[PDB]
Amino acid sequence: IHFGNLARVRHIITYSLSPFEQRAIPNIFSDALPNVWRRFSSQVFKVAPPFLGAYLLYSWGTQEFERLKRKNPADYENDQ
Amino acid sequence: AAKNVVTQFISSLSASADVLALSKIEIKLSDIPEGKNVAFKWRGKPLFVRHRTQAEINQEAEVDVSKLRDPQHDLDRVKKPEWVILVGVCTHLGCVPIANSGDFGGYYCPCHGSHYDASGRIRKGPAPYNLEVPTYQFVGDDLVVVG
Amino acid sequence: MAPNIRKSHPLLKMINNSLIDLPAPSNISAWWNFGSLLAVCLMTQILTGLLLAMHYTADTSLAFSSVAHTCRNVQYGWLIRNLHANGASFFFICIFLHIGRGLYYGSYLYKETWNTGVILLLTLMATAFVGYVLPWGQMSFWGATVITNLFSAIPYIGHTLVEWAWGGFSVDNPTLTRFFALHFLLPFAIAGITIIHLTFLHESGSNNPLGISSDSDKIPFHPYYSFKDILGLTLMLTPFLTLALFSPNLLGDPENFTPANPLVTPPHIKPEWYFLFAYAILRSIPNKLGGVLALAASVLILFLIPFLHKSKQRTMTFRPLSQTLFWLLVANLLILTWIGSQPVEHPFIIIGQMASLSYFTILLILFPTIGTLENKMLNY
Amino acid sequence: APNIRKSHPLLKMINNSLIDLPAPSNISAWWNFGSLLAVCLMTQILTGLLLAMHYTADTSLAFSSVAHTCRNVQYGWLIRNLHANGASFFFICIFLHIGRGLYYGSYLYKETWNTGVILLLTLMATAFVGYVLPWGQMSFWGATVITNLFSAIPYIGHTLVEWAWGGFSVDNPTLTRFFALHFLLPFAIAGITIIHLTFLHESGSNNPLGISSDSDKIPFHPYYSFKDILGLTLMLTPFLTLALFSPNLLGDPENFTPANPLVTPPHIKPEWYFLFAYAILRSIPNKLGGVLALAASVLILFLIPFLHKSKQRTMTFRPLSQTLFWLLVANLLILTWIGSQPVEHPFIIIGQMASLSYFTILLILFPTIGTLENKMLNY
Amino acid sequence: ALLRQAYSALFRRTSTFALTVVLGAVLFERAFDQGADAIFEHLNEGKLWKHIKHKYEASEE
Amino acid sequence: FDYLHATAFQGTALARTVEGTTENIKHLTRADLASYIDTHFKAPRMVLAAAGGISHKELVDAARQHFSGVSFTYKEDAVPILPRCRFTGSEIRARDDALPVAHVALAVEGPGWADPDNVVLHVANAIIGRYDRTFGGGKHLSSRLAALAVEHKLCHSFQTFNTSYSDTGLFGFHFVADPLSIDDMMFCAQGEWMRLCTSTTESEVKRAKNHLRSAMVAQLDGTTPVCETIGSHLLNYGRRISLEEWDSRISAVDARMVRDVCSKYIYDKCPALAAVGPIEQLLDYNRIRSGMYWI
Ligand code: HEM
Ligand code: HEM
Ligand code: HEM
Ligand code: HEM
Ligand SMILES: CO/C=C(/C(=O)OC)c1ccccc1COc1nc2ccc(C)cc2nc1C(F)(F)F
Ligand SMILES: CO/C=C(/C(=O)OC)c1ccccc1COc1nc2ccc(C)cc2nc1C(F)(F)F
Ligand code: FES
């Protein structure tokens, strides 16, 4: 039993419609998408930064590692 | 979705492909001489496929047994005449009868007697039933497919 | 008596008071869908495991082939095998997000629910560990050998515990048969403890993205979250199955299609993706014992998070500084993961030691610090 | 909550079922079996795990792996002894648990009772598969004979059977799936046992007089914790004595011989705890009818709650029911005995009688005598 | 107006709704399977045994 | 009930209270009131009703005398048909935990005066009946819902209603209960509604009819109530319907009929809900909606 002892609430009215009177996915273009963008925008600069900083590190270390496999022609010049 | 996944899993429990591979055995009748009996391994136990001569559908098909132990009346479940297919396992204590001797020309289980005539039927001995006769056919006459 | 037999019945009252009339916050996001997925996943692993166990043979001379026989001969044995191995992955992907969510939204403040969560993680890790040995391929044997050999670095009680655990002088048949038993067992303990997990949770009820009392707006778990969770299931399940059925061997090591051989050490011994980050931290500290301790702490550190919370707010929803630090940490983990799959050579070795160092730093120093700093920026 | 035993979501549980749990002040020693059954169960699981860690589910290694366990594993022989004998102790305890409940009308607690029946069936299936594991002659033929009865169910006969065997006869595929089931079922037992105790706690324990014990309840601890611990050691002494001094008393020697599909043993018979059912099985010659008779011999337990006519709960004050009850118990020793005897006169007819009397006593006599007794009290 | 008809005949009574789901599944299976195999095979013309089978199926030796 | 109307017929005329708004009362004009009377209080839209010891002829005479003014145009003798009000399955929840008890009212759209089904509906309501804590019948009342209400202390009171209008209506029920018993009451109530659509017995109807008969007769106890009936009958049914006719209609109702009529208006419909007070324990429209199907 957790429904009824939860909180002390006063003077709040709420209105709702049966699901059969409304649209399941309404205002896709006028509301949905705009917010999807809103949300994306506000986070990109917090998330993306470190992931990008990792891509770099990854990319560098992967190459720097391959570079150390190639040879340095300056070890076979005094070989005549 | 549910019906298929459940089907798939339930199937997992039935015989695997390797086990099924030993399910049936196809024997070549065109390599078994008269009278002489041959035993082939089928599902771990012996399988007897004898080529009944002329004096077997006669000297062993006239058995005047009234209340024959195991009620085996040929017309019930048997086919080819010069062909008798059996499961070489004594119904007494699962011993493999020998088609060699047999007090009745048929088979003899050297475990406790049990003499089976040349028709796969218990005669003199302890074994209650007659050496079981399996499923098969001659889709290709020179071939019999047991199992 | 009670009017509806859903409130009175000692059993239907249970199904009801935890899945039908259970009060849930009206605003929990999709990051709250992982608990159910973890559960469903668990029931799934157990089912496919039993199906496989019914055709397995715990013996060094038959293990590798019994599994091959299962895939090759058992009706849909290949499919059941695929789902089980890949299910273990799904299981971990789900569990890591489950944890992440909890760290971000301060769910760990529900200490008992959180501490049992950690125990579930460890049990799951040991479970996958022993399960991995069963097919008895090269990686199965060397993974078992290398890892269980670390215990001999413990003082005194070490060299013993190891030969006790192995049942001999090296990973051999006796080790295999006891691993099958443990693998068959642990999952049930997981189910057990999962019950305890949900019991503690239900004391308080779910937390929610804003971290403020949801008492003013609770909703019945059904149909809201039953439908939301079922949808969340199908959403995840599509990639799981897609990867499973179209790229079966994407995640697996090919060295495991070769029967274990004690006289041939594989060139690169590395775990499944979900253990890589820990492998990296293990190898970061050269010194058998110190590396073991560092590995141990990499996971046991989770028991400390509840105590390093300094913020006056529960979640990170309204704490921009903590948010980036959080994503730094996540990215810190991809790096350790990557490092874990790379050989022990420059530049990897140093990148590795850094990532490890940063990992513990972020959790033990920065997080508690930034929280304090943030309270002052709110004038608190 | 002042004491952390009432408030803590876990210590509250240990407390509300083993420490402050209200128990009738007068429950006798026949109320000690529930805990023994429990302890037994945790014990079987522990020794089972220890054995499973040296077992190999394969027809070419099963027999020998167990032999290896007894001969080479440190204390392997002891762990093996305790497990097989523990299965017996388990049944001795479960049979008394049931009797007690029949005598004292505990079955009136229907859900507690119905779950009890399910536990019995699960336990029987568990011992059945576990018996196959050592792969001896009785293990193979027991498995062969019993599982072969299902093919007597018209239509889906040979089907369910060859599905369950995973082939055409009891073979390796059957063995490996039996190991899995034997490793699994015990946990279901533990699971359901939890449910069993939950329903029980709704009402609380019944007591020998069959009258409300509300006027005199006592804390499970220390009263029953001490009483139960004592009840344990009392039983344990004979269990261990028979185990350590006469290991092979209960076992069939035919199982010290590796299973052989080409040699049917002379006398195929189960362990003592299945004998009574074996007897009822053969009592009816006709594969299907014998199966049904066997089925009902156990499933009949689901009917007891509905054949109670007495106005009193127990049999403590019903002398007629008492003797009828003891007749029933003795009826069971007879079936047991018959079960271990070959199928030959006089045994065959003695058997059919004992079976017939068994169902008669439960379906006819008991409900009748209860009615008769109510009138003798002028009710 | 099928929606209307369907709702009154199929989706109204929970009894007819379930009965509808069954026949729905029965029909859907038969159809989804054929179409699926048909798509799969067409995508693999001449590679399956089914295809090259004639070359050795009573047409050799 | 105002909230019930406000939401059931949201966005329409029936959604308004009779007393009007605070703003309107503060600003209505001598003009508006005059305009209302002139526009609305007109001969073809009125009925002079009398009950008691009076002579019809004598009465009609007096009418002609003081009910003068005759109409010229055709518009003055036209009785305007009102724009139909759209029903909406929805809910309004006014929460105040400081109130002593909760009020809940749930309803589906009714047919409207003219429809013969209204007879059955009233018979239906007679089966569910009503109840309040001072009913001496107690645990023995014939109403299943009243019984449960007593057994489990579900409410302080409850009542069913079939509020008819010209072209629409509201068929539902209303109960008052303690904050912690709202759920069970609603549960049992919707239960009884489903019983109506699926299992009503001939026994239940036999009694319902007798209760409804006594009820209609009771609405004609005195001159004022008989006058009210005449006034309304003409105004709503365009004539008077006697007790002899009513009773015939009522006698025609049988179990089979009640089931079909209730199923027609109740089963799987989106109700309108109004809840006021400490309503936390009653929740989710979705859950209420599912209560609208499967006996
Ligand atoms: C066997 C694995 C696990 C299962 C089956 C599981 C299951 C659940 C379920 C079903 C929920 C509720 C729904 C949800 O919020 O997702 C939950 C909540 C939670 N779990 Fe787990 N969990 C598992 C592991 C863990 C782990 C490893 C942790 C953390 C170390 C953990 C921490 C939590 C916490 C703190 C909550 C509270 C969620 C909130 O409301 O904020 N769980 N878990
Ligand atoms: C928490 C659930 C479980 C997890 C995480 C899990 C994980 C694993 C893993 C990682 C493997 C190796 C897969 C591979 O081949 O690469 C495995 C194999 C196996 N598991 Fe599990 N398992 C679980 C539960 C079970 C259960 C309950 C059983 C037994 C009833 C089981 C039986 C097996 C068997 C027989 C194998 C060997 C065959 C194979 O390699 O596919 N598993 N498991
Ligand atoms: C896994 C096996 C079982 C376990 C672990 C178990 C455990 C328990 C426990 C601990 C109790 C409480 C103390 C006592 O009265 O002994 C109990 C009570 C009871 N059990 Fe079982 N039980 C088992 C099987 C069964 C069976 C087979 C039946 C009957 C078909 C049954 C019927 C009952 C009933 C009716 C009670 C009520 C006792 C009373 O009169 O107070 N139980 N059981
Ligand atoms: C309800 C509990 C259990 C019962 C009634 C039980 C009973 C049995 C029985 C009758 C046997 C044959 C004993 C013999 O004559 O040799 C057996 C064998 C065995 N059981 Fe169990 N068992 C139980 C639980 C377990 C568990 C939980 C495991 C596994 C973790 C297990 C593992 C084994 C193994 C490995 C064998 C074969 C070796 C042997 O024959 O001693 N058992 N069990
Ligand atoms: C039997 O070995 C199984 C391995 C595996 O990946 O299992 C899925 C495996 C294979 C190769 C190399 C290492 C492992 C196991 O690795 C671990 N296995 C671990 C198991 C449990 C816990 C608590 C921590 C673990 N940490 C690690 C770590 F990766 F850090 F070394
Ligand atoms: C794998 O077979 C194991 C037997 C056994 O004694 O188990 C301990 C065994 C051995 C020889 C002959 C028969 C059996 C099993 O017998 C039964 N096993 C049963 C197992 C479960 C249930 C519900 C009923 C059973 N009934 C019987 C019955 F004795 F009646 F035939
Ligand atoms: S087994 Fe053949 S005579 Fe006995």
PDB file of N, CA, C and O in Angstrom, chain E residues 3 9-11 14 26 32 36 41 46 52-53:
ATOM      1  N   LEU E   3     -13.144  -0.389 -40.176  1.00  0.00           N
ATOM      2  CA  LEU E   3     -12.733  -0.121 -38.805  1.00  0.00           C
ATOM      3  C   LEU E   3     -13.909  -0.341 -37.888  1.00  0.00           C
ATOM      4  O   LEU E   3     -13.801  -1.016 -36.871  1.00  0.00           O
ATOM      5  N   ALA E   9     -17.279  -6.602 -34.648  1.00  0.00           N
ATOM      6  CA  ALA E   9     -17.214  -8.040 -34.805  1.00  0.00           C
ATOM      7  C   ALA E   9     -15.989  -8.688 -34.172  1.00  0.00           C
ATOM      8  O   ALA E   9     -16.079  -9.765 -33.572  1.00  0.00           O
ATOM      9  N   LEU E  10     -14.844  -8.025 -34.290  1.00  0.00           N
ATOM     10  CA  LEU E  10     -13.602  -8.590 -33.797  1.00  0.00           C
ATOM     11  C   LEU E  10     -13.043  -8.067 -32.498  1.00  0.00           C
ATOM     12  O   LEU E  10     -12.698  -8.849 -31.620  1.00  0.00           O
ATOM     13  N   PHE E  11     -12.959  -6.753 -32.367  1.00  0.00           N
ATOM     14  CA  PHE E  11     -12.354  -6.148 -31.184  1.00  0.00           C
ATOM     15  C   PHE E  11     -13.251  -5.822 -29.979  1.00  0.00           C
ATOM     16  O   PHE E  11     -12.758  -5.450 -28.912  1.00  0.00           O
ATOM     17  N   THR E  14     -13.842  -9.522 -25.773  1.00  0.00           N
ATOM     18  CA  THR E  14     -12.505 -10.045 -25.573  1.00  0.00           C
ATOM     19  C   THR E  14     -12.415 -11.464 -26.135  1.00  0.00           C
ATOM     20  O   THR E  14     -11.351 -11.890 -26.588  1.00  0.00           O
ATOM     21  N   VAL E  26      -2.459 -17.718 -37.497  1.00  0.00           N
ATOM     22  CA  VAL E  26      -2.453 -18.841 -38.430  1.00  0.00           C
ATOM     23  C   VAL E  26      -2.249 -18.368 -39.865  1.00  0.00           C
ATOM     24  O   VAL E  26      -1.353 -18.845 -40.564  1.00  0.00           O
ATOM     25  N   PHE E  32       3.482 -14.962 -44.223  1.00  0.00           N
ATOM     26  CA  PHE E  32       4.799 -14.405 -43.973  1.00  0.00           C
ATOM     27  C   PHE E  32       5.916 -15.387 -44.348  1.00  0.00           C
ATOM     28  O   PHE E  32       6.954 -14.980 -44.877  1.00  0.00           O
ATOM     29  N   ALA E  36       8.632 -14.722 -47.268  1.00  0.00           N
ATOM     30  CA  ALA E  36      10.008 -14.634 -46.813  1.00  0.00           C
ATOM     31  C   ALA E  36      10.935 -15.570 -47.592  1.00  0.00           C
ATOM     32  O   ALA E  36      11.993 -15.153 -48.065  1.00  0.00           O
ATOM     33  N   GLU E  41      15.017 -16.853 -51.599  1.00  0.00           N
ATOM     34  CA  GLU E  41      15.438 -17.656 -52.739  1.00  0.00           C
ATOM     35  C   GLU E  41      15.656 -16.815 -53.986  1.00  0.00           C
ATOM     36  O   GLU E  41      16.650 -16.981 -54.692  1.00  0.00           O
ATOM     37  N   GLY E  46      19.850 -19.679 -58.457  1.00  0.00           N
ATOM     38  CA  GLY E  46      20.870 -20.619 -58.897  1.00  0.00           C
ATOM     39  C   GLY E  46      21.978 -21.047 -57.944  1.00  0.00           C
ATOM     40  O   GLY E  46      22.845 -21.837 -58.334  1.00  0.00           O
ATOM     41  N   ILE E  52      20.402 -26.114 -58.407  1.00  0.00           N
ATOM     42  CA  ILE E  52      21.314 -26.997 -59.136  1.00  0.00           C
ATOM     43  C   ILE E  52      20.980 -28.480 -59.001  1.00  0.00           C
ATOM     44  O   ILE E  52      21.633 -29.326 -59.593  1.00  0.00           O
ATOM     45  N   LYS E  53      19.954 -28.785 -58.225  1.00  0.00           N
ATOM     46  CA  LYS E  53      19.534 -30.164 -57.990  1.00  0.00           C
ATOM     47  C   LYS E  53      19.242 -31.013 -59.235  1.00  0.00           C
ATOM     48  O   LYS E  53      19.594 -32.188 -59.269  1.00  0.00           O
TER      49      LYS E  53
END
